[PDB]
Amino acid sequence: KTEEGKLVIWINGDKGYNGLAEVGKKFEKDTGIKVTVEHPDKLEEKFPQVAATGDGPDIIFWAHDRFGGYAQSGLLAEITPDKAFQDKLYPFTWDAVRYNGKLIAYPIAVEALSLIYNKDLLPNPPKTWEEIPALDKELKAKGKSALMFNLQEPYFTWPLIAADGGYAFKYENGKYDIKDVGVDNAGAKAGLTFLVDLIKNKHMNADTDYSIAEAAFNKGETAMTINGPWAWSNIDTSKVNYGVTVLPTFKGQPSKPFVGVLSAGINAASPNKELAKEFLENYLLTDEGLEAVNKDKPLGAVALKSYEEELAKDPRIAATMENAQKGEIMPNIPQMSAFWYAVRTAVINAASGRQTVDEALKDAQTRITK
Q1: Distance CA 62, CA 64 (A)
Q2: What is the CA radius of gyration of the chain?
Q3: All residues at 6 or more sequence positions from 169 whose CB lies less than 8 Å from its CB, including other chains
Q4: Pfam families in the record, alphabetically?
Q5: Total structural domains in the chain?
Q6: In the beta sheet, which residues pair with residue 7?
């Protein structure tokens, strides 16, 4: 047999020392556990680098996107096939970090987006953004707008442009692969087109940055935004009284949200599965593990179906999962850089009138895929 008396856990959430340390203590008091939790910046690069020299006892917790990649070439130990293990979780939060009858980790955070309504000093529309011209027109009359938010990001802005019908990659049983890229479709155009309409007459310019746009809502002269447990985890002074709703409609379709799985997997190759497999299985599946973290946790996030229910208590998660599953999960290849650069260029290509967006970006597909 192989028994030890140490437990290392890597997490980049900034918390969970009381519960993680308190639990392992319990394992120690019975006969063999000492758990440590580190929260560095290179955690991801460090982990695979340390993993390779001589780390051993020590797990890693971070988004699935790079864990996907690292999983392929980086340093994740693609767990083996089980029955009740995968059969005991739910289809959405576990499907985010799931491969063709495979999976290299457990998720613990759902990134998504919901509609928030301003009450006290902000009257919102019933179902269409189309009201902006009208409702914003009224705001203009004084000095404000109905809706304020970012001004150049994918994930969220991407989702809208996705409304009509431009998906990222083509997911087909196997994988998007590469030769099927349908982002730059009539819907991406049509979608960004309606966006261009907004900026075309009211917004006019489009240099409001994340930090600057942040300042805009900071003063609070807008009566509506679309956000969720992903871009704004630590909500700012945005009127205590606010509603929490599902995203709105657009050209007969819902915006495509980017899917986020914050998950801690067991190494690349196989790190003492006996100790980690039992505790994780016997504690994480307890209100002590799952809920001790949760308390440490902030608000939006995840950690196993049962705890999904307890955690679900908050209106955030329910919406967070609803969108997380009905959207696009970041691929699993290094080519993603080709798009971010192409779409950001193309986007800027459409906003200044010097264009060649369809082509620059379309051809981009040709390049990124060929």
Answers
A1: 7
A2: 22
A3: 176, 177, 178, 180, 181, 182, 183, 328, 331
A4: SBP_bac_1
A5: 2
A6: 35
